[PDB]
């Protein structure tokens, strides 16, 4: 529904889809050569179908070709400060592909807008749709534009004759978060047969180790998934298949 | 709150019509034959 969508949203009003309780093989993201940019920072792209996280959010939008380099932790710029701010400790990935053949009219596609005037930098993962007239000067702007009162949004000129730097690029970002809640979205990772009372390599919701699993009697609460010790090591584990 | 290295004060007297000709990139008799201001003028002008 994201990649094969007929239309997208603006820069500041990016589309945010939260995903929960699904599988992703991630193999389609590697063989597809249509992606012009594919930068994974928090987690390596090769080791993606073997980890697992709690939740994931996909933020998709369409920007200019020159702004594609602005989606990076610590990067500054117009879009990076007034349209979409990325945290420094961002654990996720970014994909981007050129679509000048689709999102460009014969005379110019002006349906895409971007925020260029704002008196403060945006917060990480913040969405602002404030259409209030920006006050560039010292005179008050009481809903009237003109001198020292300009519109906070500006339209993109998407023509098929523009250079590669001024071409429309569809950019999606995947942000992963891992909490003590049961991990929902990750690769398929078919469950192996459960074996008890043997020194084996165990793997539970990404937590990998070596040990012997035995029956227990500790009554864990329904929201308690993992149990830690004084040395921050795992002592008891709840089977993600059966209680 | 910014304090610089050196100051240059150019003082003169012009006509009432030449008051508009004191600016970077101005055209006129005074701005071309008497006193011309550079395009990258870093300063200020006070006329009374």
């Amino acid at each position: 529904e994201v990649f094969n969508a007929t239309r997208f949203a603006s820069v500041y009003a990016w589309n945010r889809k939260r995903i929960s309780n699904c599988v992703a093989d991630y193999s389609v993201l590697y063989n597809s050569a249509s992606f012009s940019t594919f930068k994974c920072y928090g987690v390596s792209p090769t080791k993606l179908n073997d980890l697992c996280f709690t939740n994931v959010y996909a933020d998709s939008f369409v920007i200019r070709g020159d702004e594609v380099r602005q989606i990076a932790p610590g990067q500054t710029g117009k879009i990076a400060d007034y349209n979409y701010k990325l945290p420094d400790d961002f654990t996720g990935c970014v994909i981007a592909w050129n679509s000048n053949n689709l999102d460009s009219k014969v005379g110019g596609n002006y349906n895409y807008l971007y925020r260029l005037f704002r008196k403060s930098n945006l917060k990480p993962f913040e969405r602002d749709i404030s259409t209030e007239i920006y006050q560039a000067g010292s005179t008050p702007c009481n809903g009237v534009e003109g001198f020292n009162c300009y519109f906070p949004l500006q339209s993109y000129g998407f023509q098929p004759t523009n250079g590669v730097g001024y071409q429309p690029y569809r950019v999606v970002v995947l942000s992963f978060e891992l909490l003590h809640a049961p991990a929902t979205v990750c690769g398929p990772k078919k469950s192996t047969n459960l074996v008890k009372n043997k020194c084996v390599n165990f793997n539970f919701n990404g937590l990998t180790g070596t040990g012997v699993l035995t029956e227990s009697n500790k009554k864990f609460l329904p929201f308690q998934q993992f149990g830690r010790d004084i040395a921050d090591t795992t002592d008891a584990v709840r089977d993600p298949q059966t209680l | 709150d910014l304090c610089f290295t050196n100051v240059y004060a150019d003082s003169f007297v012009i006509r009432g019509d030449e008051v508009r000709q004191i600016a970077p990139g101005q055209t006129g008799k005074i701005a071309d034959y008497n006193y011309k201001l550079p395009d990258d003028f870093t300063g200020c002008v006070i006329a009374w």
Partner: antibody, heavy 128, light 108 residues
Framework: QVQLVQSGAEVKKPGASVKVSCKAS????????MHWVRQAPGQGLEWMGW????????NYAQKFQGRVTMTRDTSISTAYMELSRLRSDDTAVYYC??????????????????????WGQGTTVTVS | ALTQPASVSGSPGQSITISCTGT?????????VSWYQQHPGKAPKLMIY???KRPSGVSNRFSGSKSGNTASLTISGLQAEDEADYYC??????????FGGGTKLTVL
């Protein structure tokens, strides 16, 4: 090459309304405050309003404030002007006006400068 | 709302000038002056921007000035082609970039 085609001539009855079309191309359409400037036959030229295809923002003359409704469709990149409650001195040739710069001249006074690309002609003959 | 001559007469090669007075609020307070030239059956063509600055392509013979509330367009070396109307304007506080009575320049 900024090309600008204005709609055809019109005859109207007074007190009615007239709508003139204004189709632009050859440039970044939405990046301009486009004005609408009129002129009675053999008279002086008379400005009426302007519009931003971006954000739909516009501003009219107080003389026209109330009788003029200016719209635009950026998809076909075409601005439109309407004048209701027509009368005799409204008989005139009207044009739009594409502006010189872009209002990315943050304080480049845009768009309080000019109309560089003017339109052919629209003759409104308001005669009973 | 500005006041320029309706018609000015000059000879070829002569330096003629057409003024237009606004108010202390429009001309006397803003270097946002405008000078257009229009030929019969033709669209208005900008000649002078910002009081004395010439847009790209405009011939140097057109010079701009302003004193208090009156702007001035000086055409040195009048030519036969210099026959046209001139329309000055000044920002008026709102809307917007209109003009004077318009002056037809004739070259005897």
């Amino acid at each position: 090459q900024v090309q600008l085609v204005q709609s055809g001539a019109e005859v109207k009855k007074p007190g009615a309304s007239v709508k003139v079309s204004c189709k632009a191309s050859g440039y970044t359409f939405t990046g301009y405050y486009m004005h609408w400037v009129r002129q009675a036959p053999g008279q002086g030229l008379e400005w009426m309003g302007w519009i931003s295809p971006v954000s739909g923002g516009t501003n009219y003359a107080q003389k026209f404030q109330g009788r003029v409704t200016m719209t635009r469709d950026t998809s076909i990149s075409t601005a439109y002007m309407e004048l209701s409650r027509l009368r005799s001195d409204d008989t005139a040739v009207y044009y739009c006006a594409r502006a010189p710069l872009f209002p990315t001249g943050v304080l480049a006074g845009d768009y309080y400068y000019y109309g560089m690309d003017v339109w052919g002609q629209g003759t409104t003959v308001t005669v009973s | 709302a500005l006041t320029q001559p309706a018609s000015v007469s000059g000879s070829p090669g002569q330096s003629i000038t057409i003024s237009c007075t606004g108010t202390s609020s429009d001309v006397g307070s803003y270097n946002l002056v405008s000078w257009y030239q229009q030929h019969p059956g033709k669209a208005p063509k900008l000649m002078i921007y910002e009081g004395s600055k010439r847009p790209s392509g405009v011939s140097n013979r057109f010079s701009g000035s302003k004193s208090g509330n009156t702007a001035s367009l000086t055409i040195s070396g009048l030519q036969a082609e210099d026959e046209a109307d001139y329309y000055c304007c000044s920002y008026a506080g709102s809307s917007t970039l209109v003009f004077g009575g318009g002056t037809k320049l004739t070259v005897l």
